Amino acid sequence: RPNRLIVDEAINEDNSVVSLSQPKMDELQLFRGDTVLLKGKKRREAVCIVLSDDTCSDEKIRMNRVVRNNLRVRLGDVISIQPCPDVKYGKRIHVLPIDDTGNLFEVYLKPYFLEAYRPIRKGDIFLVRGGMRAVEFKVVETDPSPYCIVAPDTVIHCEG
């Protein structure tokens, strides 16, 4: 059967990271920086980097509200986690802001992604802090699909 963990709250508010206990990582043969595929409710998936967290109970997983929201889960729910070793570097991504001023790229997207090597999945909604406010974006498309690592050479289109 799949490998299952209890959703816990993150104290590190990074959109791209989930935390496990080192003992649980050993068991699951996951290592620092490994990309993992998380499965939640409503056939939702998320792709994140895994890091150890000495504050995490073996049976729990720390993830922020962005990740939880993407998986349609609440604190205390159960998710599955499996390795996702076939992730490619992104050639091109299409992101749109959730429309409900300034350069979205220069103020939000560039600083967010810059040398950050964040794994993303098509359909992700993520929140970027910046310019006093904070904005959410939806990942409309990635290439390769349906997920990729957003690298320094990855081309973003933010429109349409």
């Binding site: 990074d14 990271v17 290592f31 620092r32 920086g33 990309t35 980097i49 890091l51 090597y117 794994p119």
Partner: peptide
Amino acid sequence: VTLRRRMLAAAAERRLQK
């Protein structure tokens, strides 16, 4: 040469140490 997962982890750790 370097291993990819380590690059991904190091970038995230930098974000958390800030």
